Design a protein around this ligand. Structure first.
Ligand SMILES: Nc1ncnc2c1ncn2[C@@H]1O[C@H](COP(=O)(O)O)[C@@H](O)[C@H]1O
Ligand SMILES: [Mg+2]
Length: 310
């Protein structure tokens, strides 16, 4: 119950130049309506088409970031907004940049007791056959080969056989100077924990129809399931929500986003990444998690924006 005047003049950052301009336009237009439904003085601002300095010059005090990919997510616009004195939703420079770097995220997690798949690295110019032998010996198969980060050119690959690993390594190393090779977490399920301020949001179980939550399962298929309830017992659900929040916090992220994790057959969790720029379309996961606990869309957006006060 915040007087919408306390928010002042608000920009919704949407659109941009990235390959995810269209999810951002969709999300941002809805966010904008959510804020205006609450009587907040909100206005769209597409940084690809307006000069960024206009945020300061036109007197905007804060921004709801609905950008996705590139400068909108990686710390670059975060830094510029801090430089221009504009408060914004989501994580600051370090958290944003670190969240997109799966290598350094996993190092920090390993040092701070956040569970994450065992992994090795391969560098461009390595003896890929030699590295493959050593990695299989340590981790077995299957393996996930992914950018250290991140997703730029070469899609995540599940390697099922030792003899296929050298080629997968060489190809991944052509498009990132650091490649992560993780043990495949098998025999459980896949989950995500949405984080929004102190809201108690339920876990979601992600059930791809195919091998893993690949591009096809995310963007092509209409049959990926996003399940609430997630199927876990109350104690485990509480435990994993707590670890998810610590996993975000230790990276310097602040509490808007999602933490993604796998369970093995024994029910142990292994975190894969954080996402500091989740979607806000009417089919996106944070609005679903919020609606499951009685929080509607406009309420959710207002709550996220409230974290920029004080
Ligand atoms: N180590 C892993 N074990 C099991 N599944 C994984 C692992 N890494 C990635 N995946 C799957 O691949 C998808 C995309 O990987 P990523 O973008 O790195 O999270 C994940 O959402 C999971 O479905
Ligand atoms: Mg993304």
């Amino acid at each position: 119950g915040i007087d919408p005047k306390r928010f002042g003049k608000v920009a919704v950052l949407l659109g941009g130049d990235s390959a995810e301009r269209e999810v951002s336009l969709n999300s941002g237009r809805l966010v904008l309506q959510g804020l205006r439904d609450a009587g907040i003085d909100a206005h769209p601002f597409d940084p690809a088409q307006r000069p960024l300095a206009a945020l300061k010059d036109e007197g905007f005090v804060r921004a709801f970031n609905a950008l996705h990919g590139g400068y909108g997510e990686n710390g670059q616009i975060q830094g510029a907004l801090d430089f221009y004195g504009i408060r914004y939703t989501g994580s600051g420079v370090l958290g944003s940049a670190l969240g997109l770097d799966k290598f350094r995220t996993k190092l920090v997690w390993q040092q701070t007791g956040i569970p994450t798949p065992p992994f090795e690295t391969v560098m461009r110019g390595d003896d890929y056959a030699a590295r493959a032998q050593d990695i299989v010996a340590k981790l077995g198969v299957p393996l996930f080969v992914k950018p250290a980060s991140e997703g730029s050119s070469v899609a995540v690959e599940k390697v099922k056989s030792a003899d296929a690993l050298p080629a997968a390594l060489e190809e991944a190393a052509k498009h990132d100077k650091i490649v992560i090779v993780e043990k495949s977490i098998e025999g459980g399920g896949e989950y995500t924990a949405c984080i929004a301020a102190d809201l108690d949001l339920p876990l979601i179980r992600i059930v791809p129809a195919g091998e893993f939550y690949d591009y096809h399962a995310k963007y092509i298929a209409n049959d990926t399931q996003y399940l609430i309830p997630c199927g876990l017992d109350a104690a485990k659900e509480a435990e994993f929500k707590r670890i998810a929040r610590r996993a975000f916090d230790v990276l310097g992220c602040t509490d808007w986003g999602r933490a993604d994790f796998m369970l093995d057959a024994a029910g142990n969790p292994y975190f894969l990444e954080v996402n500091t720029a989740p979607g806000m379309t009417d089919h996106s996961l944070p609005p679903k998690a919020a609606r499951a606990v009685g929080i509607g869309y406009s309420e959710l957006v207002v709550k996220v924006l409230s974290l920029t006060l004080d």
